[PDB]
């Protein structure tokens, strides 16, 4: 019953190929609901989930006004960080930002987040107190000093404790049929000989939401962490996720192995084995 909202911003310079592209996407948990792309033929905030479509023109214009302003600001920020690292005008660079609020199962604010990165490295993050900053290096210390002067932390705390949580709760209600519905994994075990002496057992989980899941293999009831091949959880494209875990076992010790599945959608954790 825990929920979160996040916005993800990506600003990317591209010397010789026009001004830096800014893209913003918004999520509630693992469901994207809005996008804005400065490279679109006619840049505007666009809906990406059915339950946001009910918001009226003033919502779409407010979002668009904010993201357009961010497009210009991030372009200045990219020029500034270039300078802070004494970098040439020839290279492409990226600023990323991810911020938002986490609610507990009672709908109360658990914590807020606001983190930025430059070229994929931690640059500056708002501390959990929503009042002070952690800067990665002497370049980010400059940003920190600027942000302290414009009272940014104070502004973010007001948003994170206020509008962020209020809007997240609104979205949760408007999208309750999907956002507050956990779909359990559909599970099975496959067996494929690799040779005369060994076979792969692969434990599948399909059609689950949200993406959070634990899939493990045990041998005689102990975890097989080092010997388990475990793919990244992957989107199916219909809101659901997929995952598998594989172990190569001696033929025919198959029955000594059990696949264990934990997911929010499951009223009981699952133990599965290969069924010949």
């Amino acid at each position: 019953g825990s929920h979160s909202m996040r916005y993800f911003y990506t600003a990317m310079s591209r010397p010789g190929r026009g001004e830096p592209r800014f893209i913003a996407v918004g999520y509630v948990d693992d469901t994207q609901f809005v996008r804005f792309d400065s490279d679109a033929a006619s840049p505007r905030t666009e809906p990406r989930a059915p339950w946001i479509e009910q918001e009226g023109p003033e919502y779409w214009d407010r979002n668009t006004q904010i993201f357009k302003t961010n497009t210009q600001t991030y372009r200045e920020s990219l020029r500034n960080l270039r300078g802070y690292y004494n970098q040439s005008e020839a290279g492409s660079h990226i600023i990323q930002r991810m911020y938002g609020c986490d609610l507990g199962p009672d709908g109360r604010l658990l914590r807020g987040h606001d983190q930025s990165a430059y070229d994929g490295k931690d640059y500056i993050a708002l501390n959990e107190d929503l009042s002070s900053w952690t800067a990665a290096d002497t370049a980010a210390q400059i940003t920190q000093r600027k942000w302290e002067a414009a009272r940014v932390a104070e502004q973010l705390r007001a948003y994170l404790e206020g509008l962020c949580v209020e809007w997240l709760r609104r979205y949760l209600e408007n999208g309750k049929e999907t956002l507050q519905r956990a779909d359990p994994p559909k599970t099975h075990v496959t067996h494929h000989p690799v040779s005369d002496h060994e076979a792969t057992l692969r434990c599948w989980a399909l059609g689950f939401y949200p993406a959070e899941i634990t899939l493990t293999w045990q041998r005689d009831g102990e975890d097989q962490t080092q010997d388990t091949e475990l793919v990244e959880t992957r989107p199916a494209g219909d809101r659901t996720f997929q995952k598998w875990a594989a172990v190569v076992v001696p033929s025919g010790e198959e029955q000594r192995y059990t696949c264990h599945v934990q997911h929010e959608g499951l009223p009981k954790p699952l133990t599965l084995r290969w069924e010949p």
């Binding site: 916005y7 913003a24 918004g26 919502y59 407010r62 979002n63 904010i66 993201f67 302003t69 961010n70 210009q72 600001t73 200045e76 920020s77 500034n80 960080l81 600023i95 911020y99 930025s116 500056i124 940003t143 600027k146 942000w147 414009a150 940014v152 502004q155 973010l156 948003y159 509008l163 962020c164 809007w167």
Partner: peptide
């Protein structure tokens, strides 16, 4: 809804 204040880094 997104945060409404821009601030240059």
């Amino acid at each position: 809804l997104p945060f409404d204040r821009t601030t240059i880094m």
